[PDB]
Amino acid sequence: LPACPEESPLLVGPMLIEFNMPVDLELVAKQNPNVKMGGRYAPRDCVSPHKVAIIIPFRNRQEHLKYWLYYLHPVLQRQQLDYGIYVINQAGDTIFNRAKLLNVGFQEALKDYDYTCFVFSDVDLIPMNDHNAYRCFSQPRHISVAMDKFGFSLPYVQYFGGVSALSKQQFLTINGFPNNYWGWGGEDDDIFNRLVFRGMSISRPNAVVGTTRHIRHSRDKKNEPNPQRFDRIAHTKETMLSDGLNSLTYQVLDVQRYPLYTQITVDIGTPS
Numbered sequence: 001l002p003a004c005p006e007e008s009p010l011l012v013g014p015m016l017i018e019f020n021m022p023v024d025l026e027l028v029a030k031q032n033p034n035v036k037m038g039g040r041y042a043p044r045d046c047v048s049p050h051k052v053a054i055i056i057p058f059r060n061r062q063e064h065l066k067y068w069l070y071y072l073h074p075v076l077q078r079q080q081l082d083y084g085i086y087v088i089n090q091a092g093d094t095i096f097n098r099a100k101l102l103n104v105g106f107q108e109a110l111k112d113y114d115y116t117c118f119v120f121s122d123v124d125l126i127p128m129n130d131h132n133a134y135r136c137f138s139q140p141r142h143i144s145v146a147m148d149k150f151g152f153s154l155p156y157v158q159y160f161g162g163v164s165a166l167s168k169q170q171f172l173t174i175n176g177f178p179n180n181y182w183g184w185g186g187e188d189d190d191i192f193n194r195l196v197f198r199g200m201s202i203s204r205p206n207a208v209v210g211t212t213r214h215i216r217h218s219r220d221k222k223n224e225p226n227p228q229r230f231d232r233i234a235h236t237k238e239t240m241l242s243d244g245l246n247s248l249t250y251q252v253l254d255v256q257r258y259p260l261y262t263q264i265t266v267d268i269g270t271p272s
């Protein structure tokens, strides 16, 4: 097989995105025949240079996830990516830890295949233009740049939350993500700090291509804003040295290969 072209010729650009109709994953699987068990896909006609593991931090967001799968799968295939979907389900009912789940995702996906790119996506964010590439670049990539919830523009120029993509080397270079941001807030800013402290800059598509929809939702229980977040992001430079991949432990409780995704239920513990 020849290499796929640099930019996919299958893209159609702007798309209509809606969250008011029911979704049946059996039907989605039928509509996405080429997606193999566990949510894996690679083009039949050419070799993609993008071996992407898409990591979703998760707990009790099945409805959002259904929308995510319905919209992203068609888009990811048009982008001609060699990809896999991983939903990192946090076991238990204690305080949520988005970033630690993301680290679990990186480490576990690597056990399945030689992925060299990682897209970290919240479960409720849908891209509105398939020209917004869900793969890696020479610098860390911020993907969800123009979210409807922020008035279709960045909330601040150093905002790196929502959806992003880091190559395997970029992720390893920053010792991954912090493991001690329990509850909502700041871990994305910590991550931005890590990248900057390791000589990188944020790459982004333009605001039109990067237009993204956030599924309106209410606060989840057990993910209360973390009061010590402002203090933690002020010391990233020092803490990133020993907090992240090199200080990570967890216990996978279950791995389920669904037609459209692999769900890893994991026990990431509680504080300290």
Ligand SMILES: NCCCCCCOP(=O)(O)OP(=O)(O)OC[C@H]1O[C@@H](n2ccc(=O)[nH]c2=O)[C@H](O)[C@@H]1O
Pocket: 056, 057, 058, 059, 060, 061, 096, 098, 121, 122, 123, 124, 125, 184, 217, 218, 219, 220, 221, 223
């Ligand atoms: N007015 C309504 C207030 C809603 C504010 C809740 C915070 O909203 P956001 O900043 O979108 O963050 P969030 O969606 O709650 O958390 C980000 C991401 O963590 C994941 N997440 C978080 C909490 C939870 O219980 N389950 C879960 O899966 C999910 O991928 C989510 O998209």
Ligand SMILES: CC(=O)N[C@H]1[C@H](O[C@H]2[C@@H](O)[C@H](O)[C@@H](CO)O[C@@H]2O)O[C@H](CO)[C@@H](O)[C@@H]1O
Pocket: 155, 156, 161, 184, 185, 186, 187, 188, 189, 229, 230, 233
């Ligand atoms: C540290 C933090 O809370 N970061 C979140 C960021 O916070 C905003 C604002 O709400 C904070 O008061 C100031 C403090 O300097 O920083 C930012 O301007 O908001 C983002 C979007 O909701 C979150 O993703 C960050 O985690």
Ligand SMILES: [Mn+2]
Pocket: 122, 124, 214, 217
């Ligand atoms: Mn949300």
